[model samples]
Target: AVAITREEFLQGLLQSSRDFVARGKLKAPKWPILKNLELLQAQNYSRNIKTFPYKELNKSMYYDKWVCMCRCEDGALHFTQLKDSKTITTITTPNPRTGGEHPAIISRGPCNRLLLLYPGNQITILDSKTNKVLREIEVDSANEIIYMYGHNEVNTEYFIWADNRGTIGFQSYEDDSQYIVHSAKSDVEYSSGVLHKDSLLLALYSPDGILDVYNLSSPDQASSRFPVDAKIKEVKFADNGYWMVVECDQTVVCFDLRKDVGTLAYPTYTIPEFKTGTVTYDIDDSGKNMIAYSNESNSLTIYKFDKKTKNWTKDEESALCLADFTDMDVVCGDGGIAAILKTNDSFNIVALTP
Candidate 1:
């Protein structure tokens, strides 16, 4: 074919599409469309780029230029590395333990580290690049491992894991020993916990719905405590540790950690009415906005905290349908928001941004 102008090429393609459709030779699939020009541009720009499939990954995250997947197969902890959406190699941890829980990537030291947490307070630290087990230790024998939080700092690299018995302890990449932070009564059901801003604030919760906030720098110092009736199912800090969001039993709540640290009275806002039953949600690293998806509604809802108003603004759009799936994963990065639609045979990554 002779060289054609760019416009001519596109126009020719468009004409071909029209003729194909008229002849019933082409079928167009359903896709999102927007009336707002700006948002429409964003939706058009957003697209499915890459996907890597394996046995249901226990945990996955972007690690430098590679995407790391902590696969729990046959109750074993294995590391799968990917470059440009292609699997590079799978690294196996020696003497894999059962109940391989949260796997996290912490980057602050000279080398990035991977935390493999297992039941019975077992933890293994690995070099992020080579997947080498740098250290392994028992963080706490107080109770079986339930939750873990890792902080990678230049001077210190440690992680805290909690147990069902309400015992919290710390283990470091350098020390290779665990020290107890605190332990609660045997009846205490440690629901959720998080280490904010690399351990500046350590928050823990119980079935009684009490929030115990501690200043990690001085574990012996006085702590701030708050009582909430609804237990926290998920807790997250945003906006550089200025805002705290929690998904309660039936509602989602937010707290201005900056203002509510001592008060411990009321949430800045408690959104009780959600169009979709909260099946899944995600918070961006920047902590700017939180997007929640409801499987029933097949739509995404966005909530943003307005610093000026000191409150979260309401979302109006309900037709923001992305896809219909009983199972999918939401992921966010510097580029934009996206979703991983995993099927029985294949997985598709759908981008939700311009």
Candidate 2:
């Protein structure tokens, strides 16, 4: 079994990662040290590499702006500033006669606005200091059992938003349809609303199994429910009450909620972006600690949150901002960005200084 010599397959996909997988699209698991004919020639060289059939996401969240970066989801970085911070724009609109071109590359959009997600269920709102995308809201269409799509560009979630009238809804930020939050339901479901420390957390779900817990400041505020075993994914609050769940995978749950009988006490504590495999973890709002992941060995892994004894450790030295596209000229042509993990830890690639 010998045929891999593209520099020994770029030193095992750049030092055999532990998270953030997507090396030219897919395939890289069958490891166990690869043997059976080099694991069938690495799954026949991963069937053919280079992939992005769709969710080519990477919201780019940073907020320090240098060249206008934005590509998130487990691979954070968002830079696009201006509000006297000193101009830094680059995404104009109007281009879809069925063509392409749109980059305000954000996710979880926040500050000075930037949450584009247009088309049918449009959700644009660009204003990164006059880059212009000001408002085109037309939300709701990504209801995968009840909306939970958010990567944290920062507006608590939804730098741009819209939600198809289930009877109309919108609150604050300056009014869209008119304060309604929920009243729309096909079966009911929603996620991505984080704003803790005083309260503003949402993570509802129901079809007849309930896992609800809604609280948003005033107006009789406060509601709770927890009967979980599965299907309540995402509630993130981190620290002081410890919480971060993506419906479990390797392990990550922490909730004590001042226990007075709240769901009779449960997520008392937990964490493990990777003690093994099956990845898809995301948490990094400095919620007092940190977390970042993605797997199948594409690369990206960061974990830090000890807080005197809450748990989420794995920073040994610091260096997580992934990269290592197998260097076949970045998986066979046009692909190369560095800075991630300084040289190997994976999860950072700031290359845009021109």
Candidate 3:
């Protein structure tokens, strides 16, 4: 029965010197947990901090089933063949051409091996089990761009960049052998990206309070475009190709890809409201409605996919939401209805397991 905002929320998420500070010489500095109301608008998952500990981990990213570890020390990227929670194999990495190279982002492609975009405008491959250097590709004009991203779409991923000078475009992960990949055109801007079946879903914000969508046909393909009156912080695909999980505003909106033409065969809506202030949610398919989302209010909500009608819901109001994308009973996770309650955040992966 720990509170969400209590210090316990940070228990296991951080590390302290195993042996240090004898006598009165060591004074622990206060590192406050930052919760900004503007997080919904300012920070997407781009800066989300994830880590692995068995070995010193710089940062972590996932695509589909693979978990990627950015090995900053060795200038390598470790790809663990993990689906669910078990590790099937490991991809140690190759000595990069650039000595001080480290990936700004990592993502998993359907092809099994993960993709990485290092600072030096280079990309490489690793044999998950054999720990072999399969290939290495480089990006051109690496020094010019600042904000960048690596995105997975279908079975492939693309390396993209954006800078204060406004350089925006992408290139195939396989095209670069030793040279860098530059955009054919440089006008479009891309903020963040994730794989969505045949397309690469992008997040672009306009001053008018609208969120835009885009897609890429191939690794070398350009991003497609769409406009929606919503503020999306993070976008994730659902188990079904037609559905998507979007964290926007104070709610999560599920957009139906199955819809085509001018008519939205499936309408859009937000989850139910749980409380006031702002909420942050992270969904994973672990429990029945495996998707879990929580907020600083120390609340976590679990959602289930109603296979009967291919909707998201429970028999009763066991959790939340009764909305759907296609059918009357088609319950889409939205508003405060699809919200999760936080029992605690005492540790790195803290939860109200009990």
Candidate 4:
């Protein structure tokens, strides 16, 4: 019989490629892995790296099922649409910007297409099957789009983007038309916007900790307002609605959206331990819980959600609270997380195992 401990078996998985040369030999890095609510007693999957330097994990986007990619090329915009990590469909565009990140998002509908933002205040649509530029939409502002979200249901398709100047707008996948969904009111620095499926209510969160819910049917004004704590970092909505995740100064708070739209109160669950700097939070598409981290912290904090009870909790024994590798951005996918583990040379997309 073969003789090897779990650590020894994992150590053998190291390699000799350009990517490996940059990141060094893979050791038995203790990565985070979880089930719905409990930590698996034993692991089923193994750790693996996807891409290299220049791929911004925060700029990465995923689709309805199992497709995602990130910005990995320079001078020219190369978007690698990975079926998972290994399988790739790259769509490149010639650009003048040498570095920094541009945002891209996926739309799910009768077809799955990619919406990529580039320099020159341009947004381009790529046909996934052909990898051809379908159409381009140009805007007035020069500010980079820092936040973007897309929703497409049945016959409706909407893409929302927030710029540095608080320019938040929604575009149509049907005609490639774009318009400002909410006009910016100063002191109300809008950072992110989420479009709800059930109510068609658009939620916009500001840095000042105020959430404004707008009905897209009547796009000119806000229907209601909710006040959160100060220095609000990021906000996310549960897929089913009635639950919201807000990242603040040093904590992750869960808000109940089931109350009156105008009612603003304290968070239902406030998790303060996973405190990172700016890039602080991430949630799966289901909004089940959050897999939160930052460049400042090594551990990935996961909060578990009980859908039926509408409660949120976390597990302590799941993974290394002090993680084995350094993480810049952690993204939640179908069954695992893709953390951007940065080294001296380049960053590797290390898949979290369970």
The per-model lDDT (C-alpha) reads 0.46, 0.33, 0.35, 0.48
**In model 1, which runs have C-alpha deviations exceeding 4 angstroms?**
1-69, 74-110, 176-178, 183-187, 206-208, 259-280, 285-287, 314-319, 323-331, 339-349
User: Each model's number of backbone clashes?
Assistant: 0, 33, 42, 0
TM-score of each candidate structure, all chains considered together: 0.61, 0.25, 0.49, 0.59
Candidate with the greatest lDDT versus the true structure: 4
Candidate 3 RMSD computed on C-alpha atoms after optimal superposition onto the true structure: 18.2
Q: 1-354 in candidate 1: lDDT tens per residue?
A: 221333443343334334322232121111122112111111111112111221110122212223334434454445543322223455655433436433332212335565555445556666756746777676536555656655432114345566665565555567544455455545455555665543456676665566766554443555566646664655655424455666564555566676755443144455534443445554443344555557675556666655576655545652356534333444443334555444332334444643
What residue pairs clash in candidate 1, if any at all? none
Question: Which structure among the candidates has the greatest TM-score?
Answer: 1
Model 3 lDDT per residue over 281-341, tens place: 4443211243333343333344454446544452233232211110000111111111112
Better of 3 and 4 by TM-score: 4
Better model by TM-score: candidate 2 vs candidate 4: 4
What order do you get sorting by TM-score, best first? 1, 4, 3, 2
